[PDB]
């Protein structure tokens, strides 16, 4: 029964895409929808999943 | 690091010898929470309502 990550604030500047290593979407248990980007420096950053660059970034990570 | 994900607990006694540190979960969350980080660096959700939890935090803080 470990913790579960969630978001409450979203970054507001598009992050240069090349800094970004991976992503995951936050569990639906969270009071809000969330995308957590993991930078290539093991930093974790919340982003607004309803935002365009955010889903662009997510899509590329896969395709 | 800004706008990081915040950890919430959605599920909830540990031998006191595995305890290495504790963390209270953000008020933004939906359930109150204490997270104990064990020496094996594994994270465990616990009820701040249970008495051993509050006892542990005291043992930690007061030492």
Swiss-Prot record, chain A:
It comes from Homo sapiens (Human). Changing residue 43 to A: Reduces heparin binding. Changing residue 62 to A: Reduces self-association. It comes from the Eukaryota. The chain holds residues 28 to 90 of 92 of the full protein. Disulfide bonds join 6-30, 7-46. The record marks 13, 41, 43 as: Involved in GAG binding. This is MIP-1-alpha(4-69).
From Swiss-Prot, chain B:
The record marks 40, 42 as: Involved in GAG binding. Disulfide bonds join 8-29, 9-45. This is MIP-1-alpha(4-69). The gene is CCL3.
